[PDB]
Design a protein around this motif. Structure first.
Motif, mmCIF file in Angstrom:
data_model
loop_
_atom_site.group_PDB
_atom_site.id
_atom_site.type_symbol
_atom_site.label_atom_id
_atom_site.label_comp_id
_atom_site.label_asym_id
_atom_site.label_seq_id
_atom_site.Cartn_x
_atom_site.Cartn_y
_atom_site.Cartn_z
ATOM 1 N N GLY A 122 5.126 13.454 -9.624
ATOM 2 C CA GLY A 122 3.678 13.553 -9.677
ATOM 3 C C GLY A 122 3.033 12.164 -9.687
ATOM 4 O O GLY A 122 1.853 12.022 -9.371
ATOM 5 N N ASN A 123 3.838 11.177 -10.052
ATOM 6 C CA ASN A 123 3.359 9.806 -10.107
ATOM 7 C C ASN A 123 2.418 9.550 -8.929
ATOM 8 O O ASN A 123 1.486 8.754 -9.036
ATOM 9 C CB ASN A 123 4.521 8.814 -10.007
ATOM 10 C CG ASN A 123 5.678 9.232 -10.916
ATOM 11 O OD1 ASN A 123 5.501 9.894 -11.925
ATOM 12 N ND2 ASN A 123 6.870 8.810 -10.503
ATOM 13 N N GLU A 124 2.693 10.241 -7.832
ATOM 14 C CA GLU A 124 1.881 10.099 -6.635
ATOM 15 C C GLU A 124 0.405 9.956 -7.009
ATOM 16 O O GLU A 124 -0.277 9.054 -6.525
ATOM 17 C CB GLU A 124 2.095 11.279 -5.685
ATOM 18 C CG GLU A 124 1.775 12.605 -6.378
ATOM 19 C CD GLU A 124 2.139 13.792 -5.484
ATOM 20 O OE1 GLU A 124 1.630 14.903 -5.692
ATOM 21 O OE2 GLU A 124 2.983 13.529 -4.545
ATOM 22 N N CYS A 174 -1.560 3.441 4.074
ATOM 23 C CA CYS A 174 -2.103 3.210 2.747
ATOM 24 C C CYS A 174 -1.082 2.402 1.944
ATOM 25 O O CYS A 174 0.009 2.890 1.650
ATOM 26 C CB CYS A 174 -2.470 4.520 2.050
ATOM 27 S SG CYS A 174 -4.258 4.748 1.732
ATOM 28 N N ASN A 175 -1.471 1.180 1.610
ATOM 29 C CA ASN A 175 -0.602 0.300 0.847
ATOM 30 C C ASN A 175 -0.467 0.837 -0.580
ATOM 31 O O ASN A 175 -1.127 0.348 -1.496
ATOM 32 C CB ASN A 175 -1.182 -1.113 0.767
ATOM 33 C CG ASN A 175 -0.432 -2.067 1.700
ATOM 34 O OD1 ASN A 175 0.786 -2.119 1.727
ATOM 35 N ND2 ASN A 175 -1.226 -2.815 2.460
ATOM 36 N N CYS A 176 0.391 1.835 -0.724
ATOM 37 C CA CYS A 176 0.621 2.443 -2.024
ATOM 38 C C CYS A 176 2.111 2.768 -2.146
ATOM 39 O O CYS A 176 2.704 3.334 -1.229
ATOM 40 C CB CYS A 176 -0.251 3.683 -2.231
ATOM 41 S SG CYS A 176 -1.591 3.481 -3.460
ATOM 42 N N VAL A 177 2.675 2.393 -3.285
ATOM 43 C CA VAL A 177 4.085 2.637 -3.539
ATOM 44 C C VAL A 177 4.266 3.099 -4.986
ATOM 45 O O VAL A 177 4.313 2.279 -5.902
ATOM 46 C CB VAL A 177 4.900 1.387 -3.204
ATOM 47 C CG1 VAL A 177 6.364 1.561 -3.615
ATOM 48 C CG2 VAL A 177 4.786 1.039 -1.718
ATOM 49 N N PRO A 178 4.365 4.445 -5.151
ATOM 50 C CA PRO A 178 4.540 5.026 -6.471
ATOM 51 C C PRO A 178 5.970 4.824 -6.975
ATOM 52 O O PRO A 178 6.882 4.583 -6.185
ATOM 53 C CB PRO A 178 4.168 6.492 -6.309
ATOM 54 C CG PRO A 178 4.249 6.779 -4.819
ATOM 55 C CD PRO A 178 4.313 5.446 -4.090
ATOM 56 N N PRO A 179 6.127 4.933 -8.321
ATOM 57 C CA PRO A 179 7.431 4.765 -8.939
ATOM 58 C C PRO A 179 8.312 5.993 -8.702
ATOM 59 O O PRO A 179 7.810 7.111 -8.596
ATOM 60 C CB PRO A 179 7.141 4.517 -10.410
ATOM 61 C CG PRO A 179 5.724 5.015 -10.645
ATOM 62 C CD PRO A 179 5.071 5.218 -9.287
ATOM 63 N N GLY A 180 9.611 5.744 -8.627
ATOM 64 C CA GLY A 180 10.568 6.816 -8.405
ATOM 65 C C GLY A 180 10.002 7.864 -7.444
ATOM 66 O O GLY A 180 9.550 7.530 -6.351
ATOM 67 N N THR A 181 10.048 9.112 -7.888
ATOM 68 C CA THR A 181 9.547 10.212 -7.081
ATOM 69 C C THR A 181 9.112 11.374 -7.975
ATOM 70 O O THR A 181 9.943 12.006 -8.625
ATOM 71 C CB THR A 181 10.633 10.593 -6.073
ATOM 72 O OG1 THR A 181 11.764 10.901 -6.883
ATOM 73 C CG2 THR A 181 11.092 9.403 -5.228
#
Length: 63
Positions: free
Chosen positions: A42-44, A33-40
């Motif tokens: 709940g942003n997920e 899945c081409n997904c890249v959340p910020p930092g780390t």
């Protein structure tokens, strides 16, 4: 289109003990899945494409 999950993840684990095992792993999860959340955090939620991406145990298989 394919996103730079590597160039992006490069930040997520820019200073992660597993700068490799992390990125690398992302190098695959990206394909999932081409997904890249910020930092780390709940942003997920923002990017469930990768968030929902988990293992059988029900744990975040991806970093």
């Amino acid at each position: 289109a394919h996103i730079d999950c590597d160039k992006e993840c490069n930040r997520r684990c820019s200073k992660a003990s597993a700068h490799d095992r992390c990125l690398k792993y992302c190098g695959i999860c990206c394909e999932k899945c081409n997904c890249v959340p910020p930092g780390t955090y709940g942003n997920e939620d923002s990017c469930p494409c990768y968030a929902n991406l988990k293992n059988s145990k029900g744990g975040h298989k991806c970093p």
